[PDB]
Design a protein around this motif. Structure first.
Motif, PDB file in Angstrom:
ATOM      1  N   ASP C 256       2.191 104.981 107.929  1.00 19.01           N
ATOM      2  CA  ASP C 256       1.762 104.206 106.734  1.00 19.01           C
ATOM      3  C   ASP C 256       2.841 104.207 105.636  1.00 19.01           C
ATOM      4  OD1 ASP C 256      -0.563 103.540 108.026  1.00 19.01           O
ATOM      5  OD2 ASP C 256      -1.849 104.905 106.885  1.00 19.01           O
ATOM      6  N   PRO C 257       2.844 103.181 104.764  1.00 19.49           N
ATOM      7  CA  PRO C 257       1.996 101.981 104.720  1.00 19.49           C
ATOM      8  C   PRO C 257       2.280 101.002 105.857  1.00 19.49           C
ATOM      9  CG  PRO C 257       3.734 101.801 103.107  1.00 19.49           C
ATOM     10  CD  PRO C 257       3.816 103.195 103.656  1.00 19.49           C
ATOM     11  N   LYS C 258       1.351 100.072 106.090  1.00 28.08           N
ATOM     12  CA  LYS C 258       1.468  99.170 107.231  1.00 28.08           C
ATOM     13  C   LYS C 258       2.566  98.129 107.045  1.00 28.08           C
ATOM     14  CE  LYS C 258      -3.349  99.689 108.684  1.00 28.08           C
ATOM     15  NZ  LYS C 258      -4.635  98.998 108.972  1.00 28.08           N
ATOM     16  N   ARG C 259       2.846  97.724 105.806  1.00 26.54           N
ATOM     17  CA  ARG C 259       3.957  96.815 105.513  1.00 26.54           C
ATOM     18  C   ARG C 259       3.869  95.474 106.273  1.00 26.54           C
ATOM     19  NH1 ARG C 259       7.020  93.483 104.622  1.00 26.54           N
ATOM     20  NH2 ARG C 259       9.210  93.575 103.944  1.00 26.54           N
ATOM     21  N   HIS C 260       2.986  94.533 105.908  1.00 26.29           N
ATOM     22  CA  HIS C 260       1.920  94.572 104.883  1.00 26.29           C
ATOM     23  C   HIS C 260       2.334  94.935 103.447  1.00 26.29           C
ATOM     24  CE1 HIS C 260      -1.468  93.952 107.730  1.00 26.29           C
ATOM     25  NE2 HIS C 260      -0.610  94.479 108.585  1.00 26.29           N
ATOM     26  N   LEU C 261       3.596  94.669 103.111  1.00 30.21           N
ATOM     27  CA  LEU C 261       4.076  94.690 101.736  1.00 30.21           C
ATOM     28  C   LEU C 261       5.120  93.593 101.584  1.00 30.21           C
ATOM     29  CD1 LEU C 261       3.272  97.996 102.138  1.00 30.21           C
ATOM     30  CD2 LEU C 261       4.384  98.092  99.895  1.00 30.21           C
ATOM     31  N   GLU C 262       5.455  93.280 100.328  1.00 30.76           N
ATOM     32  CA  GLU C 262       6.376  92.189 100.019  1.00 30.76           C
ATOM     33  C   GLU C 262       5.861  90.882 100.611  1.00 30.76           C
ATOM     34  OE1 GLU C 262       8.789  92.337  97.884  1.00 30.76           O
ATOM     35  OE2 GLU C 262       8.438  94.480  97.565  1.00 30.76           O
ATOM     36  N   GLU C 263       6.586  90.315 101.580  1.00 30.79           N
ATOM     37  CA  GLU C 263       6.185  89.057 102.206  1.00 30.79           C
ATOM     38  C   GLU C 263       6.066  87.938 101.178  1.00 30.79           C
ATOM     39  OE1 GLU C 263       3.154  91.303 103.260  1.00 30.79           O
ATOM     40  OE2 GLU C 263       3.943  91.992 105.190  1.00 30.79           O
ATOM     41  N   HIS C 264       4.837  87.470 100.945  1.00 25.66           N
ATOM     42  CA  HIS C 264       4.576  86.252 100.184  1.00 25.66           C
ATOM     43  C   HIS C 264       5.176  86.271  98.786  1.00 25.66           C
ATOM     44  CE1 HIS C 264       1.800  85.760 103.473  1.00 25.66           C
ATOM     45  NE2 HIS C 264       1.150  86.850 103.107  1.00 25.66           N
ATOM     46  N   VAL C 265       5.631  87.428  98.301  1.00 24.10           N
ATOM     47  CA  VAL C 265       6.499  87.440  97.128  1.00 24.10           C
ATOM     48  C   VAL C 265       7.678  86.501  97.344  1.00 24.10           C
ATOM     49  CG1 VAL C 265       7.863  88.902  95.599  1.00 24.10           C
ATOM     50  CG2 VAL C 265       5.756  89.786  96.625  1.00 24.10           C
ATOM     51  N   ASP C 266       8.205  86.462  98.574  1.00 22.54           N
ATOM     52  CA  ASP C 266       9.254  85.505  98.910  1.00 22.54           C
ATOM     53  C   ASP C 266       8.728  84.076  98.878  1.00 22.54           C
ATOM     54  OD1 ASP C 266      10.481  87.929  99.381  1.00 22.54           O
ATOM     55  OD2 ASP C 266      10.350  87.765 101.567  1.00 22.54           O
ATOM     56  N   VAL C 267       7.466  83.878  99.268  1.00 22.36           N
ATOM     57  CA  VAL C 267       6.845  82.562  99.129  1.00 22.36           C
ATOM     58  C   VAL C 267       6.791  82.162  97.661  1.00 22.36           C
ATOM     59  CG1 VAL C 267       4.721  81.255  99.497  1.00 22.36           C
ATOM     60  CG2 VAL C 267       5.555  82.805 101.273  1.00 22.36           C
TER      61      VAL C 267
ATOM     62  N   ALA D 259      -0.103  83.629  93.688  1.00 24.10           N
ATOM     63  CA  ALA D 259       0.740  84.623  93.030  1.00 24.10           C
ATOM     64  C   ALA D 259      -0.107  85.696  92.358  1.00 24.10           C
ATOM     65  CB  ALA D 259       1.662  83.946  92.017  1.00 24.10           C
ATOM     66  N   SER D 260      -1.121  85.279  91.595  1.00 25.78           N
ATOM     67  CA  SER D 260      -2.013  86.242  90.958  1.00 25.78           C
ATOM     68  C   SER D 260      -2.772  87.061  91.994  1.00 25.78           C
ATOM     69  CB  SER D 260      -2.984  85.519  90.024  1.00 25.78           C
ATOM     70  OG  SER D 260      -3.747  84.555  90.729  1.00 25.78           O
ATOM     71  N   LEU D 261      -3.014  86.485  93.173  1.00 25.36           N
ATOM     72  CA  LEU D 261      -3.690  87.225  94.234  1.00 25.36           C
ATOM     73  C   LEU D 261      -2.800  88.332  94.783  1.00 25.36           C
ATOM     74  CD1 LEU D 261      -5.886  85.089  93.961  1.00 25.36           C
ATOM     75  CD2 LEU D 261      -5.831  84.791  96.444  1.00 25.36           C
ATOM     76  N   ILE D 262      -1.520  88.028  95.018  1.00 22.40           N
ATOM     77  CA  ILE D 262      -0.587  89.063  95.461  1.00 22.40           C
ATOM     78  C   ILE D 262      -0.413  90.121  94.376  1.00 22.40           C
ATOM     79  CG2 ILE D 262       1.863  89.488  95.924  1.00 22.40           C
ATOM     80  CD1 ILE D 262       0.792  86.247  97.191  1.00 22.40           C
ATOM     81  N   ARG D 263      -0.435  89.704  93.106  1.00 21.66           N
ATOM     82  CA  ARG D 263      -0.344  90.666  92.010  1.00 21.66           C
ATOM     83  C   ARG D 263      -1.479  91.678  92.074  1.00 21.66           C
ATOM     84  NH1 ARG D 263       3.140  88.244  92.739  1.00 21.66           N
ATOM     85  NH2 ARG D 263       4.763  87.320  91.406  1.00 21.66           N
ATOM     86  N   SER D 264      -2.703  91.205  92.321  1.00 19.72           N
ATOM     87  CA  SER D 264      -3.843  92.111  92.385  1.00 19.72           C
ATOM     88  C   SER D 264      -3.766  93.013  93.611  1.00 19.72           C
ATOM     89  CB  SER D 264      -5.148  91.316  92.386  1.00 19.72           C
ATOM     90  OG  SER D 264      -5.223  90.459  93.514  1.00 19.72           O
ATOM     91  N   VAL D 265      -3.288  92.478  94.737  1.00 16.88           N
ATOM     92  CA  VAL D 265      -3.225  93.266  95.967  1.00 16.88           C
ATOM     93  C   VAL D 265      -2.111  94.302  95.879  1.00 16.88           C
ATOM     94  CG1 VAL D 265      -2.838  93.162  98.450  1.00 16.88           C
ATOM     95  CG2 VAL D 265      -4.252  91.430  97.339  1.00 16.88           C
ATOM     96  N   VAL D 266      -0.942  93.894  95.378  1.00 15.69           N
ATOM     97  CA  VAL D 266       0.191  94.814  95.269  1.00 15.69           C
ATOM     98  C   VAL D 266      -0.113  95.908  94.253  1.00 15.69           C
ATOM     99  CG1 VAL D 266       2.573  95.012  94.487  1.00 15.69           C
ATOM    100  CG2 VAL D 266       1.936  93.212  96.094  1.00 15.69           C
TER     101      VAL D 266
END
Ligand SMILES: [Zn+2]
Lengths: 191, 190, 287, 286
Positions: C256-267, D259-266
């Motif tokens: 862990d973590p599954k990573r399942h991290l970052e990703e769509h931040v690039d989107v 974007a706000s959804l990823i903010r809440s999840v992160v």
């Protein structure tokens, strides 16, 4: 033997297509190319000789090579129709002489002028002093019909070099019927 | 020193730069003793008997330069004449290092000139030689034409050792300059 | 006789002909020749590289064509710089680029004629981008068995060349052979333009076109991949909301973590492409 | 015919290193050589090349020659070692072609049906992707003049395959790679934008300068039609362009909502888990 690169210039001007030189100037200057290529062959093996068309557009179809075979092929079906152009005819062979790989060969040009030219005396004297700076020695042999006892060409050869420079010689066609071999008989023995 | 007496076959194994360092240690252990240091080495003197070890005879003058650092004497010119004599560039390696290290901090003048015509002999391993020497003689002087010629010779030369010798050379010429050197430091770093 | 640490100054044109002549023969091993000048013992340079034609005898000492060498050096004489030959090289695309029995069988001939004749091998396979790859070889003299086999002095480039120690079967050649160091000399202007030449890939084709092609598509049909990205939102984040509850059951991290991290931040970085390039419309449309 | 060409870094360097060959001896003119192309399809690719010594008089600015024996037997050399490689044309370093460059292609048209000449640039300055590509074609004219050859511009792109990627990708050692999503797109917004500003600026500077000086033609021909193509779209609202505005606003809705959804999840995951492992490490050790 003597080290140099001789560039022969055939005369493609429209006035060179007549048969006054037996049987025809096409075969007459062909034998002229035959005797200059075979003499330079008997002179030095390292001499490479190309051809250049002076009249109309100037293009060398045969890259400078010691073998004259491709030159003899271009002597046939050359289609020598056009107006004689002088000033560019020497410089186009000068650029072909600057493409030589070996720099130990002296720059040498032989050309045939068989037609009256419109080149002004100022242009030939500018080429004369330019060849003085470039050291190029040009041996011209005048064929065909032109001004009787050519002057601007004789003054061109005179003012071309000096002291000695042993040298540039001009051979003008005599005012009488003769074979092309008799015209080239003098230069082959002595320049 | 008993070293050459106690260890022998190890010193017989020496080759190439080993005999340089071997006779260079002769000057490290003899550091000080300004008087007899020249004549006491006559057995270990930088021969120059020509079965060429010549890094040997280069390291001998290197040994004489390690002792003669800071203050000095006519031995500086004794190495200078031998730099103008014998062979090249093997003498310049430790010899010019001896010439520059002995004149270190003295702001010697002629050394900057005769090292320019010595710098033009166009060799590689001697690159660090004249570089460290010219950098030591100019230490603290913050001169102009010295760094100008050192940065002007770094182009046409094909050697990276002359680049490193001149690197420390133009680095050693400036000492304690603080912000005064930052004008050149900006150009060297950029 | 005298041996010192060696350095090979290479030209980018040499390395280009190296990997180009080696890539066109894959898998089959080809045979080239190295061109350059010997300045001294401790430094050497290769200023040019040309390729030998492939023959039926394969890679062999007889594969070198003498009339090819005579006509090439003649073509180099009419070329600007006719430098003398130095050494040989052969590519090994199919394996770890180790010298074979024929490689030394031609090495005593290249050391006969030429004093040094450094042997170089190059392969495309090892790394696609970030490694020098290639290889280096030099034949040690068997007549030196009397004296010691362990020079040089100024071990800087030597001890740094040995590392990684290059496997076993390669350093199995460290007996009877030894490598040589390679550095890239500048020539910074050409290295900088050729740097930007491949940077055209990740930057843009013209430095204008490709991201003006990002102004061509520009969300087009780039929202389709946003719909698949928002399908990656639903997919990945519906199992991402199952993670923190499970973390409370197992107490806590399973590393862990599954990573399942970052990703769509690039989107959302493509959303920065959305806001910027669409804000260009106010500049495009008005005057 | 020829649409686009793929110029590898290998052929470009093969001209530039020859610019070092004859550049150390100088002086004027340009580096000219024979281009070795690879045609798999309508899209053209380039792999290798070779350069030939070339000189051009100014007197006589129309005089040019090449060594055909060098073109012949070396093609016999490179075709021998590699059967896929053949000459698609020639090249020169320009920077701007003089009118004499046409006849060079007309001479080598006997070697290849269509010879594409590639202008290159040895010193990178402006404005972008270097070199250039011109294909030999006869377009005649809309004015019905006797057929003359004005070389059409071919778009050039830089690419590689495998080993040519290996060499340069290790040789960069300069700037971060890429990095994807942050600096990449915005620096491209500077370069493609600003280089697009000074492009058309200097190009529109040539538009007015050619009318001011250089007449004739000059103007005609394409001037009136090309400039009217510039006047095709001004192009502003009303009306539908106003609808595209808040529609684009409705497009940014979803992405910024996500974007706000990823903010809440992160923030949920990272903050909760970090404070857990934080408070636990402090209370257990302390
Ligand atoms: Zn092999």
């Amino acid at each position: 033997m003597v080290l140099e690169s001789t560039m022969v210039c055939v005369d493609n001007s429209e006035y060179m297509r007549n048969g006054d030189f037996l049987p025809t100037r096409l075969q007459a200057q062909q034998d002229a190319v035959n005797i200059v290529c075979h003499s330079k062959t008997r002179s030095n093996p390292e001499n490479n000789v190309g051809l250049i068309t002076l009249a109309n557009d100037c293009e060398v179809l045969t890259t400078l090579t010691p073998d004259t075979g491709r030159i003899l092929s271009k002597l046939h079906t050359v289609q020598p129709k056009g107006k004689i152009t002088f000033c560019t005819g020497i410089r186009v062979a000068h650029l072909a002489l600057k493409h030589r790989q070996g720099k130990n060969h002296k720059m040498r040009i032989i050309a045939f002028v068989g037609s009256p030219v419109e080149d002004n005396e100022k242009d030939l004297v500018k080429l004369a002093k330019r060849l003085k700076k470039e050291k190029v020695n040009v041996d011209i042999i005048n064929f065909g019909e032109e001004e009787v006892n050519t002057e601007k060409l004789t003054a061109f050869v005179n003012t071309l070099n000096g002291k000695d420079g042993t040298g540039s010689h001009l051979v003008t066609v005599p005012p009488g019927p003769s074979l092309a071999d008799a015209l080239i008989s003098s230069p082959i023995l002595a320049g | 020193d008993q070293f050459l007496r106690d260890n022998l076959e190890w010193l017989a194994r020496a080759t190439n730069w080993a005999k340089f360092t071997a006779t260079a240690s002769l000057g490290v252990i003899h550091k000080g003793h300004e008087k007899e240091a020249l004549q006491l080495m006559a057995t270990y003197l930088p021969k120059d008997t020509s079965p060429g070890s010549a890094y040997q005879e280069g390291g001998g003058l290197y040994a004489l330069g390690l002792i003669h650092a800071n203050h000095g004497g006519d031995i500086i010119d004794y190495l200078l004449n031998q730099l103008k004599n014998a062979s090249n560039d093997i003498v310049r390696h430790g010899g010019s290092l001896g010439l520059g290290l002995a004149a270190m901090g003295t702001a010697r003048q002629d050394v900057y000139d005769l090292l320019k015509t010595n710098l033009y002999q166009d060799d590689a391993v001697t690159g660090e030689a004249a570089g460290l020497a010219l950098g030591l003689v100019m230490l603290g002087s913050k001169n102009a034409q010295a760094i100008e010629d050192m940065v002007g010779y770094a182009q046409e030369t094909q050697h990276e050792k002359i680049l490193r010798g001149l690197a420390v050379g133009i680095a050693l010429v400036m000492y304690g300059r603080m912000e005064e050197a930052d004008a050149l430091i900006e150009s060297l770093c950029r | 006789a005298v041996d010192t640490a060696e350095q090979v100054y290479i030209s980018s044109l040499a390395l280009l002909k190296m990997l180009k002549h080696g890539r066109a023969g894959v898998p089959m091993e080809v045979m080239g020749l190295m061109l350059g000048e010997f300045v001294d013992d401790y430094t050497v340079r290769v200023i040019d590289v040309f390729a030998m034609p492939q023959s039926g005898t394969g890679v062999s000492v007889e594969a070198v064509d003498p009339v090819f060498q005579a006509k090439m050096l003649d073509m180099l004489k009419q070329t600007g710089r006719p430098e003398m030959v130095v050494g040989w090289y052969h590519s090994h695309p199919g394996f770890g680029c180790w010298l074979s029995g024929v490689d030394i069988n031609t090495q005593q001939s290249f050391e006969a004629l030429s004093e040094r004749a450094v042997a170089v091998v190059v392969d495309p396979i090892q790394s696609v981008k970030g490694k020098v790859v290639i290889d280096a070889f030099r034949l040690i003299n068997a007549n030196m068995m009397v004296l010691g086999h362990e020079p040089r002095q100024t071990t800087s480039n030597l001890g740094h060349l040995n590392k990684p120690s290059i496997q076993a079967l390669i350093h199995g050649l460290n007996r009877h052979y030894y490598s040589i160091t390679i550095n890239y000399r500048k020539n910074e202007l050409e290295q900088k333009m050729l740097l930007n030449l491949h940077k055209k890939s990740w930057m843009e084709g013209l430095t204008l076109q490709d991201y003006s092609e990002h102004c061509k598509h520009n969300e087009s049909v780039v929202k389709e991949m946003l719909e698949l990205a928002k399908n990656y939102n639903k997919a990945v984040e519906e199992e991402d909301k199952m993670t923190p509850e499970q973390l409370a059951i197992k107490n806590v991290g399973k590393q862990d973590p599954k990573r399942h991290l970052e990703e769509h931040v690039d989107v959302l970085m493509t959303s920065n492409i959305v806001q910027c390039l669409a804000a260009m419309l106010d500049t495009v449309v008005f005057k | 015919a020829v649409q686009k060409v793929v110029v590898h870094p290998l052929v470009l360097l093969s001209v530039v290193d020859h610019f070092n060959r004859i550049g150390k001896v100088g002086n004027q003119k340009r580096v000219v050589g024979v281009l070795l192309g690879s045609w798999q399809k309508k899209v053209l690719d380039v792999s290798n090349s070779f350069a030939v010594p070339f000189d051009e008089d100014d007197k006589d600015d129309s005089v040019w020659f090449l060594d055909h024996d060098y073109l012949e037997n070396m093609y016999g050399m490179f075709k021998k070692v590699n059967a896929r490689e053949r000459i698609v044309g020639w090249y020169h370093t320009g920077p701007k072609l003089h009118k004499n460059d046409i006849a060079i292609n007309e001479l080598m048209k006997r070697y290849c049906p269509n010879s594409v000449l590639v202008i290159i640039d040895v010193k990178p300055k402006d404005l972008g992707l270097p070199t250039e590509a011109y294909i030999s074609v006869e377009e005649v004219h809309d004015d019905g003049t006797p057929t003359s050859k004005t070389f059409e511009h071919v778009t050039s792109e830089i690419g590689a395959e495998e080993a040519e990627e290996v060499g340069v990708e290790h040789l960069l050692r300069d700037i971060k790679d890429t990095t994807v999503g942050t600096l990449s797109q915005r620096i491209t917004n500077q370069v493609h934008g600003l280089k697009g500003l000074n492009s058309k600026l200097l190009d529109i500077r040539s538009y007015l300068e050619k009318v001011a000086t250089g007449k004739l033609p000059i103007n005609h021909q394409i001037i009136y039609q090309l400039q009217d193509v510039f006047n095709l779209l001004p192009d502003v609202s009303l009306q539908e362009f106003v609808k595209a505005f808040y529609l684009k606003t409705n497009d940014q809705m979803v992405v910024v909502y996500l974007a706000s959804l990823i903010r809440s999840v992160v923030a949920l995951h990272n903050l909760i888990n970090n404070k857990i492992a934080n408070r636990d490490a402090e209370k257990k050790e302390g």
